[model samples]
Target: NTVAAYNLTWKSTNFKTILEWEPKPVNQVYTVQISTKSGDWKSKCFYTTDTECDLTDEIVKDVKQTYLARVFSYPAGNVAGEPLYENSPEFTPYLETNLGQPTIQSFEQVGTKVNVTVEDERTLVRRNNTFLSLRDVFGKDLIYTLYYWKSSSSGKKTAKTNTNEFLIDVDKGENYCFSVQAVIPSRTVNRKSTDSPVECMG
Candidate 1:
C-alpha cells in the first residue's frame, strides 16, 4: 500500500464565518437553524429559505459571537416526498474591532523576510497607496481601507497611508506608536483602539 491520506483534518484556511451551503436542494426547502452555541438549536432558528437566506444580520448582532448553523431539508410535497437534513460545521463570526484587523496565527519578521500566516486559502486585496489585509467581512469582494498613526513623546505623529501593516527601516534605538481604522468604499469606518502601546528597539 502506498502512503495514505486520511481526513488529515485541519482548521479552516479563510473567512471568519463559513457559509455552509445555500440554494436548497431541487424542490426542497431549508430551515436554516443558527445559534451562538450548539445546545440551544430550537431557540436559534433565525433563517428559513425556499431559495436563499443570509444569517449575517442575526449573527452580527452580538459582538464577536461564535455561531453554528444546520439546515433541515424537506421536500416540497410532504405527502409524496420524504424528509432529508444536512448540517454545516460549527463556525465563529467576527467583527473588526476599532483599530483591530484580522490576523493569522502569527506574523514573522526574520531579517529581510516577512511571513504572514492566514487560514483563508484565498485572500483579496484592493490598493490605492494603502495595503489592507481583510477578513471575511461579507466575502472578499467587500472592500475596506484603514488609516493608522504612530506617535512620539514630542507629540510627533507618523501616519501611514491607509493600509494593514507597516515595515520601516531605521537605525536601531527608537520608540514608536501605532493605531488603525477601517475604510468602506462609500465612507470611512473608524476604529476605537487607543494608541497602541509604544515599542522601543535597540
Candidate 2:
C-alpha cells in the first residue's frame, strides 16, 4: 500500500562495502544513511533513485568496528511525514567482508604432484598510498582452499593451506584445472570467496 525499502544486503568484499536493497518504486527517490552502532547517522545519496550505494570510504577506516545502514524512501519532489525505511544487518568489516578469488600465480608439475602458488586477493585498504592484499588485512587468520580437478575428468579434490602454496596430486598424462578460493574457516557466514576462474596446467 506504500513505497518502502526491503531485502537489505550489506555486501563487503576486501573492505569495500556495498549497501543494496529493493524498493517498491512509485516515482520515488531514495537516500541512504550509515552509522556505527550507537553513533550518529551520516546521510548520503540524497534524492537518488539508485538501488545500491557504496559505503566503503565512510566504512573502511575502522575495519574492526561494526556499523549499520538505513535506506529511506520518499516520493519524488515532496515534503514528507515519516518516510518508510528499512535497516540493513549489522556488519563488521574485518570479520564479515568476503575474500576475492585468488589467481594462480605459478604452477609446476613435480613428479606425481603439481605445485601451485596462489596470489593473495587485493583489497581497497591502503597503507599511506599503496593498496594491501587480503593476507595483509587478515594476517595468520586467513587461509585458502584450492579446488582442483583433471581437465578432462573434472573429478574435483580440495586442499587447504595457510600459505599460498598447494601441492595437488594429479594423474599422469592428464591436464589439470584449478581454482583457489579465500577461506576463513572460523566464520559461520560470508566465510569464503564468491567464486574463482579456472586455470589449466599444460
Candidate 3:
C-alpha cells in the first residue's frame, strides 16, 4: 500500500527501445508486461528488480507491430500492502524505426534563397486542411526539419515545416550541405537523412 507506481514511459531509437518506470521502495518487486495493441499477452511478461527494462531485443526485433507495456509493483513480504500498477500509452516501433530519412529531391538557388524539395519514400504525408491531416494509424503528428550549414566548423540553421518543400536564405558565395529529418511531435523523435551534394551559391 505504501508503494506507488508512477512515471511509466518508454524511449526508443532506431536500434533500441527502453521501457522505464519510477522505482518503488526497497523489498518490492516489479513485473513488466508487454502485449500487442489488441490485448494478447501470452508470452511477454518480465520480472525485474530495477526500474528500467531494455526491450530492444524483444520489441526492436519486430519493426512492424505496436505494443502496450504495463508495470506492477508488489510487496516482497506479502503481509499488508496492496500492489500498484501503471501502463504505457501506446508504442509504434515501425514509425519509430522505419520512418527513414527524407531524400533531397532537388535544390535550386534564387538570389539569396535556396529552394529545396524533399521527398519522403514512406508516403506518410497529409494533404487535407483540417485536423484530419495530422491523424495517422499511430496518431503521430509528422513534421520535417531541414538542416543546412556552410561548413561543419561554422554555425548552422534549421527550418521546420509540415510540407516537404521550403526555402532558406543563404550567403552569396558560401557552399552549403543540406539534410532533412522526419519528426513526431509527441515522441520528440527524429530520423535524419544523409547530407545532399554541396552546392555553391552565387
Candidate 4:
C-alpha cells in the first residue's frame, strides 16, 4: 500500500513546472515523456535521479496544445524488475504564465455569521488555444482564507478551504470584522479583498 501511494503528481511553481513523488527505497531513476494531442511526441526525454523534474521550457512551447505525459521509475542498474509507471490525464497549458488573483465580489452578515462570495474571472485564451478553458485551470483547485477579528490585536484565520461561502461565528455585543482571500494551492498567490463592514450580533 505504501508503494502504491507514492505516485508522481505534477505541480507548477509560477512559470516553472515540477513533477513530485515519494522516493522509493530502492535506488531509482525516472523517465518523463510528453506528447501533443495530435500525437506529435517530443524527441527528447527527461531522465533524473531526483523526485522532481522541471519542465519550464517544454511547457512554454506546449502552451495551448493539449498534451499527455507519463513518468516511469526504474530500479537503478537493473532492467529486470517491472517498472512503475504513472500517467497524467490530458493537460493544456492555458493558464497565464502566472495565475491571476481571485476577487471577493460580495460580503454579508446575518444571524451571527459573515458570508463571503469570491470569483476568479481572469481569462487568458490566445487565438490558437480554444481547447484550453478557464474552468480547466481555475476550477475547484482554489483555496480560500477567511480573516476575522474583534480587533487588530485579536484576530483568527479559518482553516484553508475551497468553498465560496464562509460562515463566521460572531459574539453577541462584540463587533467582529472579516475579509477573505483566494489562493491557488500550487502557486500560493494571495488574492485578498477589501474588508467588509463590521457586524455585531443583537
Candidate 5:
C-alpha cells in the first residue's frame, strides 16, 4: 500500500491561512479540498507539488466560521485504490488565527508614572486600500495585557487595557522592563497570542 499524506496542519496568522505538511513525495502529487463545517468540500488545490497550499482566500470567506481541509496524495499511474488523504482539524480564523509579533510604539516615564504604548500587528485581511490591524478586526474583544517588572527585581506585575496606552506607577528613577500580549478572552475557549519582545528603560 502507498503512504497517505501526513502532518496535515493549519498554519494561520492575521487571517492568512496556509496548509502545510511534511515528507516530500516520490512520483506523487497532492490535491487539497476545503469547506466550511456544514458545507460541501470543494477542491482548492490540485496536484500541487509543494508541501504548502495558501488557503487564505478560501478560509477567509467567513473568518468567524469553522472550516476544514483535506490533503490527498496521488500516486503515479493507476493505483490499486483511490487516493489517500489526511484531514486537518477544524479552524476558525477569527478565533484561531494567531496574532503576529507585537511592537512597542513608545514609552515615557513621567515622574513616578510610566506610560507605555502597545501596537497591534497588521492583518492579512484588507481594508480601504490598506490592510486592517488586529485591533481593527477584533475591536472590543481584543485586549493587551502588559507584564512589567523592575529591572533589578524578580517580581513582575500585570496590567490590562482595552486601548493602546497603559500607565503604571513605578519608582521615580528605577529601570522597568515591559512586554505585552494580545488576549482574546472567549466564552468557551480563550485563544492565546504572541508576546512582544521585552523592553527595558531606566
Candidate 6:
C-alpha cells in the first residue's frame, strides 16, 4: 500500500555519501536516518525531507565503512504520535563493477584439428586480438613455426598481427595442451587471457 526508494551514489575516491529514495509523491511526511553499521544506527541519527542527503562530514576516515539508511512515514493527523517509519536497506559506499575473474567455457576437437574455444564476454579490445598459445603436454609447442596471424573485425581490417599462433603443430593421435588470449582492435591487451587445461585426443 506504500512506496519506497533507496539510492546510493558517491564519488570514486571520496567518502561523501549521497543517499536517495523515490516516489517523491506520498501521503505523509518522510523521515530518514543513517548509521555507521546496520545494527548501531541509532547513535548517528539525522532527519531529512529531501530525497538526497550528504554524509561526508559524518563518515569515519581511513577504514572500510558501511552506511545504513532508514526512511519512515509520518502520519498527518498527529505530529506528536509516532509516524510509521519505512526502513531503508543497508549498502556499502564503493563501486567496483569490473572486479570479476576469467572462466573457461568449452573445448573440442574436429577431425585432425582441435577446435579450442573459450567464452569470455568481457572484451579488452575492439579489433586487434592477442591470444596465448601454450605448449602441449608432451613439451611440444602448439605452433611449429612463427607466422603472423591476421585479425579482422566486423568489416574493418586490423593494423596489427601477431606471430604467436604458428609456433605449434599438434600431433593427430597424441595429447596436447594450449591456451588462447585475445584483445580487440583498439586495445593492446586482452581483458582475459587463459591457460588451457591438459587435453588428449586420438
Q: lDDT tens digits, residues 31-79, model 3? A: 7777877766633345556888777766644446788887787676646
Superposed model 5: Cα runs more than 4 Å off: 77-79, 187-190
Q: TM-scores for all candidates?
A: 0.34, 0.82, 0.50, 0.43, 0.85, 0.35
Give a tens-digit lDDT track for model 5, residues 1-202.
5578777888877787899887787778888889899989888788877899888887655578999888888776565587578888888778777767678898998888999998667766775668777778888987788898888789888999998899999876678899888777873443666788889984
Per residue, candidate 6 scores C-alpha lDDT tens digits across 149-192 of 21321221112213222223345555553334332233232222
Point to the candidate with the largest lDDT: 2
lDDT for each residue of candidate 4 in 1-202, tens digit (9 for 90 to 100) = 1132155666753345665676653555667777777876563345566666666567765465766677776556634546667777665554434443455666667877666665545343323654334344556855677666665457565645666667666676666555555455564333333343443323
Candidate 4 residue spans exceeding 4 A from truth: 1-6, 43-47, 78-84, 95-202
> Tens-digit lDDT track for model 1 on 1-202?
1111112111222222224454434544456565667357643333244433445445534434666655565545443335455555445433332333433333445565333332322332223544224443434423322222233445443334333344543223443333332333332433232333222321
Clash count, one per candidate: 7, 0, 2, 0, 0, 22
Q: Between 3 and 4, whose lDDT is larger?
A: 3
Task: Please estimate how well model 3 matches the true structure, expressed as its whole-model Cα lDDT.
Answer: 0.65
Index of the highest-TM-score prediction: 5
Q: How far in Å is the alpha carbon of 82 misplaced in model 3? A: 5.9
lDDT of 3 at 176: 84
Q: Where does model 2 exceed 4 Å of error?
A: 78-80, 110-113, 149-151, 154-156, 168-175
Q: How far is candidate 6 from the true structure (C-alpha RMSD, Å)?
A: 15.7
Q: State which candidate, 2 or 5, has the greater TM-score.
A: 5
Worst 10 residues of 6 by lDDT: 136-145
Task: Rank all candidate structures by their TM-score, best first, as comma-separated numbers.
Answer: 5, 2, 3, 4, 6, 1
- lDDT, candidate 2, 45-108, per-residue tens: 7878789888899877779899999988877744357768888889888888877656788889
At residue 144, candidate 6 shows an lDDT of 22
Local distance difference test values of all predictions, in order: 0.39, 0.82, 0.65, 0.57, 0.81, 0.39
lDDT, candidate 4, equals 0.57
